[PDB]
């Protein structure tokens, strides 16, 4: 039983699903509902801005990757591992990684490859949880994610 993995997969898969289909999953989040719910809401807020702001960089990258099937998704995971290969980890890289995943997920749906969205979410979660588990733990997992992106209203 790996709660950190389960929670991460739940958050990331639901964002990619709702981005691809355009409809939220109105089931409540699983055990540990508070953190996961705020994490997904934060992901919508920050992730949507990332895709809007950087739609150019995302579109160019997707065009060159030429993603067509589940094989191209596994090759995609190879590129994603390089997100931390310079020794640096932060929430900005992690949210950008997930945002591109949603961008790819939308593309996978318009080419009638919705079956690859679930593998895509699992790959992203694998990269995060299986190679950066220690860093996530030190941040307090998705609680750290929520707090970092919380915007302070200091009047």
């Amino acid at each position: 039983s790996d709660e950190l993995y389960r929670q991460s997969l739940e958050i990331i898969s639901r964002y990619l699903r709702e981005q691809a289909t355009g409809a939220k999953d109105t089931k409540p989040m699983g055990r540990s509902g508070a953190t996961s719910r705020k994490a997904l809401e934060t992901l919508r807020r920050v992730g949507d801005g990332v895709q809007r702001n950087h739609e150019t960089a995302f579109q160019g990258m997707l065009r060159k990757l030429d993603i067509k099937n589940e094989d191209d998704v596994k090759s995609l995971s190879r590129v994603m591992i390089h997100v931390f290969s310079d020794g640096v980890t932060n929430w900005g890289r992690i949210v950008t990684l997930i945002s591109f995943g949603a961008f790819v997920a939308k593309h996978l749906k318009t080419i009638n490859q919705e079956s690859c969205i679930e593998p895509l979410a699992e790959s992203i979660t694998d990269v995060l949880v299986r190679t950066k588990r220690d860093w996530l733990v030190k941040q307090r997992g998705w609680d750290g994610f929520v707090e970092f992106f919380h915007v302070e209203d200091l009047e």
């Binding site: 920050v46 990332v50 950087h54 960089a57 990258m61 060159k64 990757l65 190879r78 590129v79 390089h82 997100v83 290969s85 310079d86 640096v88 932060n90 929430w91 900005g92 890289r93 992690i94 949210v95 950008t96 990684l97 591109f100 970092f148 992106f149 915007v151 302070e152």
Partner: peptide, 21 residues
């Protein structure tokens, strides 16, 4: 993988933006 650094840099831009929020 030659695109790797692009997303790292974009990620650091996003992180540096919120780092003052």
């Amino acid at each position: 993988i030659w695109l790797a650094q692009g997303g790292r840099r974009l990620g650091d831009e996003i992180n540096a933006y919120y780092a003052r929020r």
